[PDB]
Amino acid sequence: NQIDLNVTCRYAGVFHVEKNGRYSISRTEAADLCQAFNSTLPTMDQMKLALSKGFETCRYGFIEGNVVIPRIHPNAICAANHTGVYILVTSNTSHYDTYCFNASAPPEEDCTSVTDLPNSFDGPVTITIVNRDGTRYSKKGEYRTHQEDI
Ligand SMILES: C[C@@H](NC(=O)C1C=CC=NC1=O)C1CC1
Ligand SMILES: C[C@@H](NC(=O)C1C=CC=NC1=O)C1CC1
């Protein structure tokens, strides 16, 4: 009973979380997941400021109200070569990665590793935070409050 959560650097508090190496998070799961990191789904304004500090990914993830990809450099296979906060307009499907916003993070680029999941609750799952540099932090718990996400 295991969940891997791959996380990035934080940029003005915003970071990306990919679960189990594939698009697998619903909107309800995303809010609960960010809550376990003492975080929330970013607003569009918080995501635009994170972009301006150096944040970009090549993966769709929830923010408040939309599913987006922040892009700095144009790449043909990432958000159809767009730059800026690219908003997903048309999709048949409901599961993506998520972004999260932690208000206590540093104001600009924070590429230190994540070593805590401070607000997870009691549960049976081995949850492992995987940083980009491979360092890991694991704890037994749960973060999903909606049964349909379990
Ligand atoms: C939840 C937050 N991490 C932390 O607050 C700590 C605190 C102490 C030690 N390690 C952490 O990752 C993640 C968003 C960045
Ligand atoms: C407690 C410890 N770590 C942190 O505060 C954080 C916060 C966010 C992300 N990673 C951390 O290690 C301080 C010594 C460095």
Side-chain angles (χ1 to χ4, degrees), residues 2-62:
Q2 220 266 320
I3 291 174
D4 271 348
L5 302 175
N6 272 84
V7 304
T8 63
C9 298
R10 276 71 64 218
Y11 286 87
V14 180
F15 61 107
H16 167 244
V17 185
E18 178 173 348
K19 174 187 189 193
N20 290 338
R22 63 184 288 125
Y23 289 121
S24 61
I25 309 174
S26 67
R27 179 167 287 283
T28 53
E29 182 158 351
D32 285 354
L33 180 57
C34 298
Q35 180 171 117
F37 285 102
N38 282 147
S39 295
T40 47
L41 290 180
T43 64
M44 180 65 77
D45 286 348
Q46 288 161 346
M47 177 57 79
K48 284 172 174 173
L49 190 64
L51 169 71
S52 81
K53 307 300 189 177
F55 193 39
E56 67 175 345
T57 77
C58 191
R59 301 276 296 174
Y60 288 111
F62 303 100

Side-chain angles (χ1 to χ4, degrees), residues 3 26-27 32 53 63 65 71 74 97 114 121-122 124 140:
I3 291 174
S26 67
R27 179 167 287 283
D32 285 354
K53 307 300 189 177
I63 63 165
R71 294 301 303 163
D97 294 350
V114 175
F121 51 88
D122 182 83
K140 189 186 61 77

